[PDB]
Write an enzyme that holds these catalytic residues in place. Structure first.
Site, PDB file in Angstrom:
ATOM      1  N   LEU H  40       0.967  -1.249  -0.010  1.00 30.40           N
ATOM      2  CA  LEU H  40       0.241   0.090   0.059  1.00 30.40           C
ATOM      3  C   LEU H  40       0.886   1.315   0.061  1.00 30.40           C
ATOM      4  O   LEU H  40       2.311   1.311   0.510  1.00 30.40           O
ATOM      5  CB  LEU H  40      -0.992   0.149   1.087  1.00 30.40           C
ATOM      6  N   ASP H  41       0.407   2.309  -0.629  1.00 32.69           N
ATOM      7  CA  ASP H  41       1.080   3.516  -0.477  1.00 32.69           C
ATOM      8  C   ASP H  41       0.703   4.338   0.645  1.00 32.69           C
ATOM      9  O   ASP H  41       0.366   3.902   1.620  1.00 32.69           O
ATOM     10  CB  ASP H  41       0.601   4.260  -1.744  1.00 32.69           C
ATOM     11  N   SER H  42       1.148   5.760   0.782  1.00 32.30           N
ATOM     12  CA  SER H  42       0.818   6.687   1.823  1.00 32.30           C
ATOM     13  C   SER H  42      -0.423   7.242   1.621  1.00 32.30           C
ATOM     14  O   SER H  42      -1.417   7.274   2.485  1.00 32.30           O
ATOM     15  CB  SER H  42       1.743   7.724   1.724  1.00 32.30           C
ATOM     16  N   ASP H  44      -2.956   5.829   0.155  1.00 36.18           N
ATOM     17  CA  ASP H  44      -4.038   4.774   0.589  1.00 36.18           C
ATOM     18  C   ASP H  44      -4.328   4.841   2.163  1.00 36.18           C
ATOM     19  O   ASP H  44      -5.105   4.708   2.696  1.00 36.18           O
ATOM     20  CB  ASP H  44      -3.439   3.502   0.080  1.00 36.18           C
TER      21      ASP H  44
END
Ligand SMILES: CCCCCCCCCCCCCCCCCC(=O)OC[C@H](COP(=O)([O-])OCC(O)COP(=O)([O-])OC[C@@H](COC(=O)CCCCCCCCCCCCCCCCC)OC(=O)CCCCCCCCCCCCCCCCC)OC(=O)CCCCCCCCCCCCCCCCC
Ligand SMILES: CCCCCCCCCCCCCCCCCC(=O)OC[C@H](COP(=O)(O)OCCN)OC(=O)CCCCCCCCCCCCCCCCC
Ligand SMILES: CCCCCCCCCCCCCCCCCC(=O)OC[C@H](COP(=O)(O)OCCN)OC(=O)CCCCCCCCCCCCCCCCC
Lengths: 154, 19, 94, 62, 110, 126, 12, 86, 111, 75, 177, 459
Positions: H40-42, H44
Site C-alpha cells: 500500500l501507498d501513503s 491509501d
C-alpha cells in the site's frame, strides 16, 4: 525572583541582546526588541501579532485555553489576542473584498430605501373619512370652544 | 508568599552621608 | 514510517497502566454505602390561593386605587344591573 | 431496544402511528377549514374595475 | 412560538438520537428512520410558511395583505416578498438535506 | 496572487514563501527552537508530576510580562515628540470638546428659559 | 458498568 | 447508544478494511502492516484513516495518522482516546 | 398599474394619495347628499371602541361585539355579523377608490 | 455483538454503477464504493420525493374529511 | 494530541495533509456520496500524476500552486467533526473533567461512601512515589549530549520500572464522565 | 452616639486583656453588637435631624455611613484572620487596635457638627491606614504607596484647613447647622474661587478624581486586605460626605467652578473603565472600577440636585459593600496562589462552585442590575445629568457597556474555562470566607428591599 531574571531597558549592545534573549528563553536570531520610540517597552521582545487561534489546536499545550507553554514568551498583547477576545486567523476571503462587498451592500440598501421613499407604493385609493369632524371631541376637543365643521360627502 | 522585609541593597542607600 | 521501536513500547506500557487505572475506577456493588394524587393540588395550589385571596381582598382592594379595570363595555339594548337603566337601541339601518 | 449496524432497524408501531395521525389530522384540518372557508383564493367581495365606471356616478362635467 | 419550539425540539431529537452532530450534510433520510420527528418537523416548516390554515396563515396572510395594501415604501415590500420566498427556500432546504436524501450519518444506528 | 493579507486576517502557514524552504540554515534554527521548547517542556513536567510538589508552579514568564506591563514602564519612558504631543492631545482634547458641547447646551437652555419660552410642561422632579 | 465521577469536595 | 469494546472495534475496523478492494478480504491480520505486508501507498493510508474517522465519527489528527500503519495501532488509538476498557 | 402612470410616464396628472379632495366637492354634482352615521357618539363611546375603529361602519361592529360577548362559548356563533361589518367596510373602501378615480378623471378634464 | 456479512455490499442496483461507469469512461476505477453501499440497499433504498413527504397522512385526512362532511349533511 | 511534532516537517506529510484537507473540503462541497466518490477518484488521479518527479524545485512549486488553488476553493463552512476543534462538543465536557488531586481534600464522610476506591488509590500513589526517583534518574542518564532533544519521553527498559512522566497521561480524565 | 463610641473604645482593652486564644472571638462578637446598637439612630420618625450634643449629630447622610463603618469591622476582622495567624499575638492585637481606631475615628467624622472636628479626624484616619499598608503589606511597593496615599491627602487638606480657618474668622462658629441657616451669597471673585478650590480639592483627591487617582491603585494593590476594604468602602466616601456638607456655603460658585470637575470625572470614568477592560492585576481592576464609580458621585455632587445627592448616597453605600466583597473574593484566591495575576488561575467553578455564585452576584451588583441599589444610584444620577445636559448619556452609556464588559470578563477569565490542573493547593473553602461574602451580600438584598433608608438629605 531577582533583577537578572526580570525585564529591563533596551539592550543596545549584542551581549545585552544575548543576555536578554537567554533571560526570555528565546533564540538570539529570533529576539527583536521594540524599536525604542520611547515608551514602556524595554528589552521585552516583539512577537508576531498573531492570535492564539492560530496555534495548533491538537497539541496538548501546558496552558490549555491559552495555547502557550510554561516558558514561551508572552506577547505584550496577551490580554486581547486570546481565543475569547480577538481572532487574526485567516479567512477564505480577503479583508479588502470583504469590506468592499459589505459596505457596498449596505450603501445600495440605503440608496434603494431612499428611492422607495421617493417612489412609494400606494394603493389607488383616497384617505379614510372620519365622521364627526375627524373626531374633534374624542381627541382632546375643548368642548366649550366651537369646533371646525369639516364635513365629508357621498 | 512571605512578607517582604528589606535587604542589604535597600539598606545601603541609607549609608552615604547625604542620601 | 510510524512509531520508532521505543515509542511503541512506551505506548504499550502506558496502555497497560491506563487500562488498569480505568478498571480501578469501577464501582463495587456496595460502594455508595450510606444510611437510609391531588395532595399536590391541595398543598401547592389551594394554600397559595388562600393566602393570595386574603392579600387581594384585605390589603389591596381596601386601598383605593390598587385594582383598576376598564369599563365593562355596555351595548345598546341591555338592562344595567346597577340601576336598571335600559340603553336604547340604535336607529334602524337601511 | 438495541442498536443495528449498517442495516435498517425495526420500527415501533407507536411512533409511526403517531406521526401518521398528526400528519393526517393536519390534512383533515386543512381540507375541512379550506372547504368551508375558501376566502384565501378570493374574498366574498370583488375588486371592482374602476376604469369601466361612469362619470355620472362620479359627477364630472366636460 | 409554536413553530420555533417544535422545530428546535425536532432538531434536538435528531441530534441527541445520534451523537452531538448538528449539520444537515450528515443527517440523511429522516422521513423513514424517524417518522414522528419528520412529520412534526414538516408540519412546523409548512406552518412557518404561509400555509393557509396552520396558524402561520392567520398572521402572515394579514401581514402581506397589509403590506401590499399600504403606501409606505416599495423596496421594503419587494425585499419582504423575496424574503418570504427565501423562507420557503430554506424550509425546503432542511426538508431536502435532512429528510429526503440517502443516509450520510455513520453506520451505527442507535 | 489571489489573497491579500492584512494586520488582521493574516497570511497562513500554507501560502507563505517560507514553510517550503529546504535550506540547511533554516533547519538548525527550527531545531534549536524545538530543543528549547522540549527542554522547558521537560522542566514543566518534571515539576508537574513530582510527588511532594504540594504547591503550584510559579510560571516566571507571566511574571516578566506583568512586570514589563506594570513597573518597567516609567524607567523606560523617555519623553519625545509623538509622546508629549500625543499625551497632550489624548489628555486635554476630549476635555475641551465635551466642554464646548455642554457649554453650548447649557447656555442655549438658560437663554430659552430666561426668554420665558421653554417647554417644561411637567418637569417636577429634576 | 458503573464509573467514579470525580467531584471536587462538596462538603464544606 | 451503548459503548464500544475492543472486540467490537476490531470487528468494525476489519469490516472497513475488507471493502477497500486493494486489500483483498484475505492476506490481512490484526498485526498486518500495510506497506510491506500488503503493498500500500501513503495516500491509501490517508484514505484508510478517513474511513476510520467517518466510521467512528471523530477525527484522527494528521500527526498521529502518520504513525498508524497497522490495524492494531488504529484499535489502540481509538481505545486510548475513547477510554474503552474498564 | 397606476404607479407607472406617474413615476415613469404621464406624470403630474395622476392624483397624489395626499390632497385627494383637491378640487371642490360639488364640481359636477348639482346636488349632494352628505354621508350619514347611525351609531351615535354615546353608543360608539360606551362600547369602548378605538379611534381608528369607530368609523362610519361601527354599528355592525357593535352588533358583532354583542354577539361575541353574549354567545361567548360558541365563538363561531355570529359570522354573519362579521360578514356585515366586512361588507360595509368593503363599500367604504369602494367609496374611497371612487373618490380617487373621480379626482383622476378630473385632473384629465384640465387638459 | 452481531454484525452482517461483508459479502453483500455490491454496487449493482445503485448510482454507484453510474459512478464506476463514468469513471471507467474517464479511464479509472473507484475503490471504497462497497463501504458507501449500505446507504442505497434495503430500507434505505428507493427515492422518496418531496410530494411523498408533504403529502403524508393525506389519505386518512381525506377519509376523515369525507366522514365529517357526511355527518355535516346528516346534521 | 498524544504525539509531539518535529521541526523539519518534510515534504511528504505536507503533501498528504493537503490531500486530506482537499478531500474533506471536496466532501463538503460534494455532499452526496456518489459525487464525492467520483471527484475523490479524480483528485487521487491529480495527485498520482506528478507522484514521481525527482525535482524538489518542481514538486515544491506544484505544492504551492496546489495550495493556492485550494485556498481559492476552500469551502467557507467545511465539515468539522464534533469533539474536534472549531466544532460542536469540542470542549463541552471540559467543565466535567475534574482532576484526581481534588480527592485529597475530601472529607472522611465522602471517602467512607467509597472505601474500596480509595483503598486502590492509596497504593496507586505509593507506586508513584516509589517509581519517581528511578524515573528522574532514567531521564537524567539519557540526555542527548549534543544538546538537541525532543518531547519523545523514552520508555522503561528494566522490570519494576514505569514509563517516565506517566502520571499526567495515565490518570487523564475520561472524555465522557 | 456616645453609646456607640465608648463601647468601641472598650473593644481595645477587650483585645489586650483577653487570652491569645479568645481574643478574635470576643472582639468579633462585641463588634457585631456595636453594629447592632448602631441602629438606634435609624429611629427618625420626623423631619428634624438628631442632635445629641454640640459635638455630635446624625442626619440621614451620616447614619448609613455610621452603620456601614460599624458593620465592616467584624468583616475586616474575620478576613484578616488567615494571614497574620502565624504572627505574634502582640502583632495581631496591634492590627485589631488599628482597625478599631479606624472605626472610632470614622464614626466621629460622620457624626461631627463642626468642620474642624471633621478635619482632624479625616486626617487622623491616615495613621492606621499607613501602618496597616506598610507593616502588613506583602510586597515592597507598599512604602511608596503609603507615601502617595498620605501626601496626596495632605497636599489637598492643608488648603482645607486654611479655608475653614478663614470661615471661622469670617462667621465665627464653623458649625454646620448655623452655616446652613446663615450663608451669604458669594461675590464671585478670584479670592472666593480659590476658596472653593481649597475647600473641594481635598475631598476630590480622596474620592478620587481622574486627574489625581494614582494613590488608590498603589494602595489597594498593596494593602493586605482590610485596608483595601476600608479604602474602597468608606475612605472614598469620606470625601463625598465632606463635599455634600461644605458645598452649601459656596453658592453660586458651584454653577461654573464645577464644569472642569464634572468633565474630568466623566471622561476619566470612561478612561478608567477602559483600563479595567485590560488589566493584568485583579486588585487593580477593582480599584479602577472604584474610580469609575466615584467619578459619577463627583459629578452628581457638583450638579447639586435632589435626585443627584440621592443617587450619590445610594451609589456610595452600594459600591462600598460590593467593592469590599470583590476584594474579599480576590483575596480568597490570593491566599492560595499568592498572585494577583488574574489569568494565572482561570478555570474555577469546578472547585469553588459556591464562591462562584458570590462572584456572580458581586459583579451583577457592580454592573447595572436593576433590582439593586447600584442601578438605582446610577440611574438617578444619569437622570440628573440628562436634566443638566442631554449629551452626557452618550458617555454614561459607553460606561455602562464597558462596565458590563470588564465585570463579565473578570468572571469568565477567573472562573469559566478549563481548570488549571497544576494547582493542587486549591483548598476547598473556608466557612469563614463564605460567611464573609454572605454578610456582604445579605445587606445589599435587604437595602434593595427597603431603599427608603439609603437615600440622603433630599428624600
Ligand atoms: C419583582 C422583582 C423581584 C426581583 C426579581 C429579581 C430578577 C433578577 C433575576 C436575577 C437572576 C440571577 C441568577 O441568575 O441566579 C443565579 C443563582 C445561581 O445559583 P446556583 O449556581 O444555582 O447555586 C448552586 C451552587 O452553585 C451550588 O451549591 P448549592 O447546591 O449548595 O446551592 C444551593 C442554594 C442554597 O441557597 C440557600 O441556602 C439560601 C440561603 C438563605 C437561607 C434562607 C433561610 C430562611 C430563614 C429566614 C428567616 O444556592 C446557594 O447556595 C446560593 C445562596 C445565595 C442565594 C441568594 C438569594 C438571592 C435572592 C435575591 C432576591 O440562582 C440562585 O440560586 C439565586 C436564587 C434565585 C434568585 C432570586 C429569584 C427571585 C426571587 C424573588 C425575590
Ligand atoms: C450600517 C448599518 C448599521 C450597522 C451597526 C454598526 C454598529 C455595530 C454595533 C456593535 C459594535 C460592537 C461589536 C463587537 C461585538 C463583539 O466584540 O463581541 C463578539 C466578539 C467575538 O465574536 P466572534 O467573532 O463571533 O468570535 C469568534 C467565534 N467563532 O467578542 C469578543 O471576543 C471581543 C469583545 C470584547 C471587547 C469589547 C470591547 C468593546 C466593544 C466595542 C464597543 C462598541 C461601543 C458602541 C457605542 C455605541 C453606544 C454609545
Ligand atoms: C418577593 C416579591 C413579592 C412582593 C409582594 C409582597 C406581597 C406580600 C406582602 O407584602 O404581605 C404583607 C402582608 C400585609 O402587610 P402590608 O402589605 O405591608 O400592608 C400593610 C401596610 N403597612 O402581611 C403578610 O405578609 C401576611 C398576609 C397574608 C398573605 C401572604 C402574602 C401572599 C402574597 C403572595 C402574592 C404576592 C405577589 C407575588 C408576586 C411576585 C412577583 C415577583
Amino acid at each position: 525572583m531577582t533583577k537578572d531574571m526580570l525585564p529591563g531597558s533596551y539592550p543596545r549592545t549584542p551581549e545585552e541582546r544575548a543576555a536578554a534573549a537567554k533571560k526570555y528563553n528565546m533564540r538570539v536570531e529570533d529576539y527583536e526588541p521594540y524599536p525604542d520610540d520611547g515608551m514602556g517597552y524595554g528589552d521585552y521582545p516583539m512577537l508576531p501579532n498573531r492570535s492564539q487561534h492560530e496555534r495548533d489546536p491538537w497539541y496538548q499545550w501546558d496552558h490549555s485555553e491559552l495555547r502557550m507553554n510554561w516558558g514561551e514568551p508572552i506577547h505584550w498583547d496577551l490580554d486581547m489576542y486570546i481565543r475569547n477576545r480577538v481572532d487574526t486567523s485567516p479567512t477564505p476571503v480577503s479583508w479588502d473584498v470583504m469590506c468592499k462587498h459589505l459596505f457596498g451592500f449596505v450603501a445600495f440598501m440605503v440608496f434603494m430605501f431612499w428611492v422607495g421613499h421617493v417612489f412609494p407604493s400606494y394603493q389607488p385609493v383616497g384617505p379614510k373619512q372620519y365622521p364627526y369632524n375627524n373626531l374633534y371631541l374624542e381627541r382632546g376637543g375643548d368642548p366649550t370652544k366651537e369646533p371646525e365643521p369639516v364635513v365629508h360627502y357621498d | 508568599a512571605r512578607q517582604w522585609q528589606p535587604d542589604i541593597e535597600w539598606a545601603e542607600q541609607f549609608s552615604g552621608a547625604v542620601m | 514510517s510510524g512509531y520508532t521501536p521505543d515509542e511503541k513500547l512506551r505506548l504499550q506500557q502506558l496502555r497497560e497502566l491506563r487500562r488498569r487505572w480505568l478498571k480501578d475506577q469501577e464501582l463495587s456493588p456496595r460502594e455508595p454505602v450510606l444510611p437510609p394524587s391531588s395532595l399536590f393540588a391541595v398543598s401547592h395550589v389551594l394554600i397559595p390561593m388562600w393566602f393570595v385571596h386574603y392579600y387581594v381582598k384585605y390589603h389591596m382592594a381596601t386601598k383605593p386605587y390598587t385594582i383598576v379595570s376598564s369599563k365593562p363595555r355596555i351595548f345598546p339594548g341591555d338592562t344595567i344591573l346597577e340601576t336598571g337603566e335600559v340603553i336604547p337601541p340604535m336607529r334602524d339601518f337601511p | 431496544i438495541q442498536p443495528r449496524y449498517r442495516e435498517f432497524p425495526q420500527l415501533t408501531r407507536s411512533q409511526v402511528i403517531q406521526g401518521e395521525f398528526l400528519s393526517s389530522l393536519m390534512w383533515f384540518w386543512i381540507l375541512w377549514r379550506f372547504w368551508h372557508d375558501s376566502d384565501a383564493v378570493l374574498g366574498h367581495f370583488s375588486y371592482p374595475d374602476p376604469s369601466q365606471w361612469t362619470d355620472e356616478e362620479l359627477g364630472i362635467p366636460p | 412560538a409554536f413553530f420555533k419550539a417544535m422545530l428546535f425540539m425536532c432538531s434536538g431529537s435528531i441530534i441527541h438520537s445520534l451523537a452531538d452532530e448538528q449539520d444537515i450534510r450528515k443527517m440523511g433520510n429522516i422521513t423513514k428512520i424517524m417518522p414522528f420527528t419528520s412529520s412534526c418537523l414538516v408540519i412546523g416548516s409548512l406552518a412557518l410558511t404561509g400555509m393557509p390554515f396552520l396558524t402561520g396563515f392567520y398572521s402572515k396572510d394579514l401581514i402581506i395583505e397589509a403590506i401590499n395594501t399600504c403606501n409606505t415604501n416599495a423596496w421594503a415590500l419587494l425585499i419582504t416578498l423575496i424574503a418570504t420566498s427565501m423562507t420557503a427556500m430554506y424550509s425546503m432546504r432542511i426538508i431536502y438535506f435532512v429528510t429526503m436524501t440517502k443516509p450520510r450519518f455513520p453506520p451505527l444506528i442507535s | 496572487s489571489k489573497y491579500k493579507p492584512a494586520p488582521l486576517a493574516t497570511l497562513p502557514s500554507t501560502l507563505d514563501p517560507a514553510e517550503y524552504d529546504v535550506s540547511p540554515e533554516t533547519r538548525r534554527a527550527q531545531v534549536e527552537r524545538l530543543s528549547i521548547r522540549a527542554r522547558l517542556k521537560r522542566e514543566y513536567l518534571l515539576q508537574y508530576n513530582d510527588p511532594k510538589r504540594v504547591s503550584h508552579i510559579e510560571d516566571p514568564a507571566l511574571i516578566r510580562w506583568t512586570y514589563a506591563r506594570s513597573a518597567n514602564i516609567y524607567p523606560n519612558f523617555r519623553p519625545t515628540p509623538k509622546n508629549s504631543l500625543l499625551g497632550a492631545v489624548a489628555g486635554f482634547g476630549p476635555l475641551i470638546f465635551w466642554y464646548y458641547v455642554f457649554k453650548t447646551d447649557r447656555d442655549r437652555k438658560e437663554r430659552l428659559i430666561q426668554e420665558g419660552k421653554l417647554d417644561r410642561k411637567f418637569n417636577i422632579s429634576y | 458498568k458503573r464509573l467514579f465521577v470525580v467531584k471536587p469536595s462538596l462538603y464544606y | 447508544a451503548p459503548p464500544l469494546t475492543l472486540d467490537g472495534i476490531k470487528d468494525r475496523v476489519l469490516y472497513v478494511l475488507k471493502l477497500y478492494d486493494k486489500i483483498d478480504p484475505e492476506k490481512l491480520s490484526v498485526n498486518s502492516h500495510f506497506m510491506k505486508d500488503l503493498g500500500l501507498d501513503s495516500l491509501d493510508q490517508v484514505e484508510i484513516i478517513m474511513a476510520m474517522e467517518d466510521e467512528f465519527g471523530f477525527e484522527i489528527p494528521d500527526i498521529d495518522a502518520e504513525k498508524l500503519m497497522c490495524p492494531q495501532e488504529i484499535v489502540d488509538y481509538i481505545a486510548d482516546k475513547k477510554d474503552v476498557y474498564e | 398599474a397606476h404607479l407607472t402612470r406617474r413615476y415613469l410616464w404621464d406624470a403630474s396628472v395622476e392624483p397624489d394619495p395626499e390632497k385627494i379632495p383637491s378640487f371642490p366637492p360639488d364640481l359636477g354634482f348639482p346636488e349632494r347628499k352628505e354621508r350619514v352615521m347611525v351609531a351615535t357618539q354615546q353608543e360608539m363611546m360606551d362600547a369602548q371602541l378605538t379611534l381608528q375603529q369607530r368609523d362610519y361602519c361601527a354599528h355592525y361592529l357593535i352588533r358583532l361585539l354583542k354577539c361575541k360577548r353574549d354567545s361567548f362559548p360558541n365563538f363561531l356563533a355570529c359570522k354573519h355579523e362579521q360578514h356585515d361589518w366586512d361588507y360595509c367596510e368593503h363599500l367604504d373602501y369602494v367609496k374611497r377608490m371612487k373618490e380617487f378615480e373621480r379626482e383622476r378623471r378630473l385632473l384629465q378634464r384640465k387638459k | 455483538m452481531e454484525l452482517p456479512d461483508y459479502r453483500q455490499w455490491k454496487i449493482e442496483g445503485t448510482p454507484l454503477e453510474t459512478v464506476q461507469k463514468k469513471l471507467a469512461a474517464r479511464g479509472l476505477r473507484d475503490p471504497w464504493a462497497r463501504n458507501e453501499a449500505w446507504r442505497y440497499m434495503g430500507g434505505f433504498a428507493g427515492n422518496i420525493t418531496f410530494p411523498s413527504v408533504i403529502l403524508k397522512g393525506f389519505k386518512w385526512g381525506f377519509a376523515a374529511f369525507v366522514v365529517a362532511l357526511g355527518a355535516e349533511y346528516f346534521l | 494530541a498524544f504525539c509531539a511534532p518535529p521541526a523539519y516537517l518534510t515534504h511528504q506529510q505536507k503533501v498528504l495533509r493537503l490531500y486530506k484537507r482537499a478531500l474533506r473540503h471536496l466532501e463538503s462541497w460534494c455532499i452526496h456520496r456518489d459525487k464525492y466518490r467520483y471527484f475523490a477518484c479524480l483528485m487521487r488521479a491529480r495527485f498520482e500524476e506528478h507522484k514521481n518527479e525527482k525535482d524538489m524545485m518542481r514538486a515544491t512549486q506544484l505544492l504551492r500552486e496546489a495550495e493556492e488553488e485550494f485556498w481559492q476553493n476552500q469551502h467557507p463552512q467545511p465539515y468539522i467533526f464534533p469533539d474536534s476543534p472549531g466544532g460542536t462538543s469540542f470542549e463541552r465536557y471540559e467543565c466535567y473533567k475534574v482532576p484526581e488531586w481534588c480527592l485529597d481534600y475530601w472529607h472522611p464522610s465522602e471517602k467512607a461512601m467509597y472505601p474500596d476506591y480509595f483503598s486502590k488509590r492509596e497504593q496507586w500513589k505509593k507506586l508513584r512515589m516509589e517509581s519517581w526517583d528511578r524515573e528522574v534518574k532514567q531521564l537524567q542518564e539519557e540526555t542527548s549530549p549534543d544538546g538537541i532533544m525532543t518531547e519523545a519521553l523514552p520508555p522503561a527498559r528494566r522490570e519494576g520500572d514505569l514509563p517516565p512522566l506517566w502520571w499526567h497521561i495515565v490518570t487523564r480524565p475520561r472524555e465522557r464522565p | 452616639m456616645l453609646k456607640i463610641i465608648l463601647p468601641s473604645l472598650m473593644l481595645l482593652p477587650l483585645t489586650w486583656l483577653s487570652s491569645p486564644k479568645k481574643t478574635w472571638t470576643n472582639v468579633t462578637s462585641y463588634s457585631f453588637l456595636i453594629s447592632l446598637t448602631s441602629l438606634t439612630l435609624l429611629w427618625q420618625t420626623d423631619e428634624n435631624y438628631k442632635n445629641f450634643s454640640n459635638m455630635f449629630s446624625s442626619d440621614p447622610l451620616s447614619t448609613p455611613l455610621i452603620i456601614l463603618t460599624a458593620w465592616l469591622l467584624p468583616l475586616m476582622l474575620m478576613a484578616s484572620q488567615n494571614h497574620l495567624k502565624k504572627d505574634n499575638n502582640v502583632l495581631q492585637k496591634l492590627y485589631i487596635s488599628m482597625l478599631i481606631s479606624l472605626q472610632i475615628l470614622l464614626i466621629m467624622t460622620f457624626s461631627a457638627t463642626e468642620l474642624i472636628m471633621f478635619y482632624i479626624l479625616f486626617e487622623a484616619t491616615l495613621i492606621p491606614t499607613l501602618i496597616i499598608i506598610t507593616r502588613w503589606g506583602n510586597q515592597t511597593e507598599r512604602l511608596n504607596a503609603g507615601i502617595y496615599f498620605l501626601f496626596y491627602t495632605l497636599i489637598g487638606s492643608i488648603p482645607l484647613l486654611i479655608a475653614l480657618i478663614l470661615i471661622q474668622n469670617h462667621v465665627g462658629t464653623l458649625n454646620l447647622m448655623i452655616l446652613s441657616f446663615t450663608t451669604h451669597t458669594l461675590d464671585a471673585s478670584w479670592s472666593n474661587n480659590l476658596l472653593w478650590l481649597a475647600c473641594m480639592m481635598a475631598f476630590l483627591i480622596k474620592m478620587p478624581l481622574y486627574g489625581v487617582h494614582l494613590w488608590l491603585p498603589k494602595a489597594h494593590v498593596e494593602a493586605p486586605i482590610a485596608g483595601s476594604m476600608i479604602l474602597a468602602a468608606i475612605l472614598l466616601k469620606l470625601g463625598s460626605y465632606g463635599m455634600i456638607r461644605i458645598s452649601i456655603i459656596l453658592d453660586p460658585l458651584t454653577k461654573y467652578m464645577a464644569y472642569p470637575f464634572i468633565l474630568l470625572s466623566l471622561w476619566g470614568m470612561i478612561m478608567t473603565s477602559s483600563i479595567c477592560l485590560r488589566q493584568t492585576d485583579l486588585k487593580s481592576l477593582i480599584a479602577y472600577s472604584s474610580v469609575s464609580h466615584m467619578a459619577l458621585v463627583i459629578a452628581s455632587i457638583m450638579i447639586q440636585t435632589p435626585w443627584s445627592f440621592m443617587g450619590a448616597t445610594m451609589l456610595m453605600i452600594a459600591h462600598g459593600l460590593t467593592s469590599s466583597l470583590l476584594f474579599c473574593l480576590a483575596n480568597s484566591n490570593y491566599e492560595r496562589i499568592h498572585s494577583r495575576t488574574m489569568i494565572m488561575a482561570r478555570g474555577l467553578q469546578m472547585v469553588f462552585p459556591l464562591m462562584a455564585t458570590w462572584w456572580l452576584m458581586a459583579s451583577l451588583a457592580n454592573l447595572a442590575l436593576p433590582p439593586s441599589i447600584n442601578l438605582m444610584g446610577e440611574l438617578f444620577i444619569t437622570m440628573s445629568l440628562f436634566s443638566w445636559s442631554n449629551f452626557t448619556i452618550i458617555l454614561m452609556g459607553i460606561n455602562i457597556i464597558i462596565t458590563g464588559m470588564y465585570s463579565m470578563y473578570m468572571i469568565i477569565t477567573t472562573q469559566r474555562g478549563k481548570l488549571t490542573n497544576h494547582m493542587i493547593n486549591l483548598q476547598p473553602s473556608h466557612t469563614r470566607e463564605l460567611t464573609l461574602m454572605a454578610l456582604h451580600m445579605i445587606p445589599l438584598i435587604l437595602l434593595t428591599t427597603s431603599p427608603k433608608l439609603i437615600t440622603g438629605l433630599t428624600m
